[PDB]
Symmetry: none
Subunit: 72 residues, 3 copies
């Protein structure tokens, strides 16, 4: 036994089935301006930092110990 | 036994079924302006910070120990 | 036994079924202005901070120990 996830189906138009998952949606991110200024200083961002990841994801830029400055 | 998640179906138009999951939706994020100024200073953001992740996600930029400055 | 989540169905147009889950929705986030100014200083944001996550999510930018400055 121990099926742990089962999605049966016989007919049906445009049926949706979401079992144990993670869904994330965003929209538009407009920025209108006339002057953008960024000043930054960093000195110590990692001193033996361990990091793990298993079955992860994101809809953008991925980084560890970053000084991006201006992202998008 | 121990099925833990079961979604049966026979017919039906546009049926939706959401078992143990995480859903997150956002909208638009307009910003209108004429001058954007950012000044930043960082000195110590990680000194042995452990971090784990399993089956995670996000709809944007992912980072650990960041000084983004201006995101979007 | 121990099914723990069961959603049966026979017919039906546009039927929705939400078992043990987490749903989060937001709307629009307009900001209208003529001058945006941000000054920031940070000195110590993590000194051995452990962090875990399992089956999490969000509809935006994810970060740990951040100095974002101006998000969106």
């Amino acid at each position: 036994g121990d099926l742990r996830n089962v999605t049966a189906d016989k007919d049906g138009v445009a049926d949706v089935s979401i079992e144990d998952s993670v869904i994330s949606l965003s929209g538009d991110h407009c920025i209108i301006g006339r002057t953008l200024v960024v000043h930054e200083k960093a000195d110590d961002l990692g001193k033996g930092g361990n990091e793990e990841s298993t079955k992860t994801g994101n809809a953008g830029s991925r980084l560890a110990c970053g000084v991006i400055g201006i992202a998008q």
